[model samples]
Target chain A: GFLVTRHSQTTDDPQCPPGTKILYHGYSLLYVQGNERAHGQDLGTAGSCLRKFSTMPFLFCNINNVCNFASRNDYSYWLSTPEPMPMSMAPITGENIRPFISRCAVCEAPAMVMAVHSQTIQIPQCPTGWSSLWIGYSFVMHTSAGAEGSGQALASPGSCLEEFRSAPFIECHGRGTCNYYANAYSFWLATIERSEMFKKPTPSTLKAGELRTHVSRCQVCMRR
Target chain B: YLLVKHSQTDQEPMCPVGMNKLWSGYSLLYFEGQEKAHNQDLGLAGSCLARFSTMPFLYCNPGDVCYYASRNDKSYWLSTTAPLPMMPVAEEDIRPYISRCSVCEAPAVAIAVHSQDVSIPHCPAGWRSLWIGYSFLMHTAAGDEGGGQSLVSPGSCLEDFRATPFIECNGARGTCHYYANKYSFWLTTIPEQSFQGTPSADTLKAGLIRTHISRCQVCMKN
Candidate 1:
């Protein structure tokens, strides 16, 4: 069965229709929580259907101050320790943002996705027969809780995150202040994702020196 | 958009009205060697075929490459027309070894680019871009026959350039490395027979040459 994502902010009822199976439901996170009061208010209550991905959305919005995650209500959190920020000066923290939650569904339909992974600097285009749905860099968060840390998953096409009163800065380890440095930052910048295409890669299909984990580009694609 | 026109004989390939010719290419096949480049296995192939008139024609080629017109030129090669052969002519005196020529064409005002970056070019206003592929060419060394002159080559020479080539290679895959070179040549030279011997005839200065590979895209005027 293929996957379909639905905007599920308004209704408490399952965003997925009767014929579809609910996969994951969450909200979005942005960098500059910018005085916007209603940022993460509506992320649906976290329930079943495993949360397969999460990451900071450094690529989605313009500002680099905040981490955008398709965060869940429980256990999911960002690395409290910060290092050199990507840009200048101190990493500014914003208050309560209410981002809406989205729902992913596995249905018997044409919608589907595949992840394109690359560690090299060269960004790849979608393979033949696939159309790009969304694309972004992958990020892994250093957090106290165990969860799938995928920048592609977090900033993935049609994913969502949970909201917080303030950008949640949890204390995992105590070193001065990671958020203080301008260039240093939290989360290891990981691989990238190219657009989705469904010809599965096999042991024989992979090139020499290619690694399963190293990815510089990722994208969601639909079959043409 | 582009169309490939191939002819095995001496018929000059021409585009229809309102369309412009883009590249003149040729193809060949090696049934025995390991497939190292594009179209190595499939001797002659094509997707778009001819529909009507005269003899039924199928534009086919074993392996082919073409000269690209990324920029404009006003040289004898571009503007001068060659007289038709009234009698049998020596093939060696002509473009030797080329059995067929596949001519690519596009609508009027359309232009093609040999872009260095993989990303396609942002076409100008009223123009649309269609990516062809990463450019490729035959391997060259210091003692290569064509020397410094740009030469036509089959896509089989650079298999990695095409994301997914229309025609797949049939032989054992061969590999090639990227190479670059610099050479000095004359701005323009008159053939020995055409030289008037005047001082002005030899005034042209040395022209330096540098080469690199890139993505190919054709931009069409809307």
Candidate 2:
């Protein structure tokens, strides 16, 4: 449930670079910058996402001065402390549902995050011949809160959709005053919601088979 | 009144130690090391210094320390072309007090400075300056986008000088500051002086071996 950091032009190949991890789990990734002329007012800060890969360190506004859980690949080490692993991964509970007080805990977090190097899985040649479809519309929300969130829960839905609902498939329990959209495709129908199936550090597949806490897990499959 | 160019040290110094302030007043010290002072790390500095040794101001040993000397006929600091500023009656009027830089009897813009402590009062942006060297070189602030112009480079210039570099764009990062006024240099060859100090160069003896802009703290006490 996180965003992957991308490589930069100066260094590192843009194609599928091995990015860095962001927060330990819940720690906030802090950042800062300034003028450095005379008055180091150079006052600035930012929050990056998880697996935050950058070709340069402390993306400086001018001279480098920051306050946060920071580190770079050149240094490849954490400046701030990493959150300790939970002793009992016993599913943290509260206002939660999905049968929250319901789902069973199979294993507690044994280590920080498991290292899954590269998982190359080939899907069975799309059962005869299924062609790939391309979605034309795409929007990248340039965020003030950087993609790197150390401790914050991501449950990243990403630019992709795990599940799509045409209409009437699911409905909001609560009601809002009113809203408007300029185009035929409105907010609710166009938005991609985080799938309940892939919210955990170790997510589950649609087939009831589990998705282990993995990294660089590459796969070629047919999306229904 | 007289015009003196102060050279401060930024790159390896060209002049000797404590020489930036000749006697007491202008430019950064980018030195020309002794020959073989470098094998290949030798940059524009060594050769530039070598080039200087062939001139009137300096002489070099193939592998030994090179030296800076005044011209047999003229002083390195004195500028026949650089006109002096009228000492302001009050400190308040000092900033606007102006001077011009000239090379080969022509002129260019005032050099930029890095600090308020700079001694010379900088002239306007687009300006004029000159130098009396082996021959003469002229400079115009008209083409100056940034960085100091070469009035009298190691070989070209003789009399004029540039203000302390207000900005060091290249080099080590954090050390440099965004400057307003650069280090000011007014060449005066004298043992002692003041704001109302020393008479103009016309009165001083000609052709001292070398002179530097002494630090203000050293001279301010006078």
Off by over 4 Å in 1: A4-109, A140-142, A145-215, B1-222
Instruction: Tell me the TM-score of each prediction against the true structure.
Output: 0.22, 0.19
Q: Write candidate 1's Cα lDDT for A1-224 as tens digits.
A: 56644332222323553344665554322121222211121111132122332322312233667643333222222222112222553323432111112223332325434333232334446545556654433222211222111111222222222110111222111111123211111221222222211111111111223322332344444545
lDDT by residue (B46-144, candidate 2, tens digit) is 222211111223443354534332101110111122222221112222112211121111122222221122233233344322212121122211011
lDDT of 2 at B66: 41
lDDT of model 1 at position B46: 21
lDDT string for model 2 (A8-37, tens) is: 111122222123233222111222211111
Docking class of 1: incorrect
Predictions: Cα RMSD each = 25.1, 24.8
The 10-residue segment of model 1 chain A with minimum total lDDT is A196-205
How far residue B79's Cα lies from its native spot in candidate 2, in Å, is: 19
